[PDB]
Amino acid sequence: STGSATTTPIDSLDDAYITPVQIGTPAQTLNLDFDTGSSDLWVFSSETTASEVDGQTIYTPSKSTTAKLLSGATWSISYGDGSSSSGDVYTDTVSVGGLTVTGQAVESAKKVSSSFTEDSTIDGLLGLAFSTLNTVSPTQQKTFFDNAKASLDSPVFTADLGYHAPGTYNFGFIDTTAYTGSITYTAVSTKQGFWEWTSTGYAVGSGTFKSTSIDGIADTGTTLLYLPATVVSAYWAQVSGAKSSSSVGGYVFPCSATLPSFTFGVGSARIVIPGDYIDFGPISTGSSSCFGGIQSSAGIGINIFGDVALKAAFVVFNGATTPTLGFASK
Numbered sequence: 667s668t669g670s671a672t673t674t675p676i677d678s679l680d681d682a683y684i685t686p687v688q689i690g691t692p693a694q695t696l697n698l699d700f701d702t703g704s705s706d707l708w709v710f711s712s713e714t715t716a717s718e719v720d721g722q723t724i725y726t727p728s729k730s731t732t733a734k735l736l737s738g739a740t741w742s743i744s745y746g747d748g749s750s751s752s753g754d755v756y757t758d759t760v761s762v763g764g765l766t767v768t769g770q771a772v773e774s775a776k777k778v779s780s781s782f783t784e785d786s787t788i789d790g791l792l793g794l795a796f797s798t799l800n801t802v803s804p805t806q807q808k809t810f811f812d813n814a815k816a817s818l819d820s821p822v823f824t825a826d827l828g829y830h831a832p833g834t835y836n837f838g839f840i841d842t843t844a845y846t847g848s849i850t851y852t853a854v855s856t857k858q859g860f861w862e863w864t865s866t867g868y869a870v871g872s873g874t875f876k877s878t879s880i881d882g883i884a885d886t887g888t889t890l891l892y893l894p895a896t897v898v899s900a901y902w903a904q905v906s907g908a909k910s911s912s913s914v915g916g917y918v919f920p921c922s923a924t925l926p927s928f929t930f931g932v933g934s935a936r937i938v939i940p941g942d943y944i945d946f947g948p949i950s951t952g953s954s955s956c957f958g959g960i961q962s963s964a965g966i967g968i969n970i971f972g973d974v975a976l977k978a979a980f981v982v983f984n985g986a987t988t989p990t991l992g993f994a995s996k
């Protein structure tokens with residue numbers, strides 16, 4: 667079997683992408699953020715603290731004939747950005763673009779931090795990292811992808827994110843019409859529970875390619891590209907007037923400047939991120955300082971290939987016995 671769903675940016679900056687998901691019987695459609703950096707399927711619900719809901723569509727397990735409370739099961743998660751959520755757990759039927767999984771753990775949020783409340787366009791997250799990162803206690807639960815694996819034509823899912831435009835998440839197949847040239851595959855380490863891989867280097871604009879190992883994760887749930895301080899300094903040195911600002915919490919550049927492209931290595935292949943993709947607009951309304959899409963990972967502890975990098979490529983998340991990541995130009 668296969669699944670295919672459209673993902674659309676939540677705003678004009680591509681801060682996040684939402685994908686419609688059908689939960690329960692009869693179906694309740696929620697727009698979830700597909701996250702390859704986490705492994706919990708959690709949704710805003712009829713149980714969430716009333717004051718912590720601001721415009722989101724809630725999942726109501728009482729109106730679902732296939733919903734079953736997983737007795738005693740609880741979950742709590744904290745993301746790298748200081749945001750968090752927690753609650754109880756249900757099992758229910760979940761479908762993504764025609765691909766159905768019965769008995770999927772659907773984590774019902776009782777408490778959400780303010781970061782989630784203020785994003786009225788995001789009804790929850792669909793974790794696509796490895797199931798070893800799932801926070802359900804005392805019995806760990808499997809991701810949607812792990813549960814669908816047996817039924818899928820091929821154990822793969824593809825991410826094809828648009829730049830200021832809709833994109834696609836495909837499950838169980840590779841669309842040969844969605845990319846150009848060849849797919850270069852690279853090894854994945856699952857030791858930390860992420861889609862961790864090693865990039866073979868970088869180039870800033872039309873400069874020479876620097877061969878160096880950059881270990882990082884393919885994370886659809888992170889907006890920006892977070893790279894080592896050495897790389898990020900070499901990039902922003904090519905932008906006139908760019909500087910690192912402690913007040914803003916990162917690199918800012920004069921909005922009138924034109925940004926060079928950024929190339930990252932995948933084996934012997936090269937993925938070119940256009941300079942426009944690195945522009946994240948004014949730091950505040952009316953400001954002439956703009957926020958950069960390439961930031962230092964020095965304070966995070968891990969390099970992240972977020973939406974900025976992923977949206978420049980067709981990305982294959984191969985969940986075979988030996989998992990691999992594939993990249994093609996599009």
Ligand SMILES: NCCN1CCOCC1
Binds near residue numbers: 681682780782784785
């Ligand atoms: N809390 C606001 C941060 N969010 C995170 C997800 O994308 C949009 C912006």
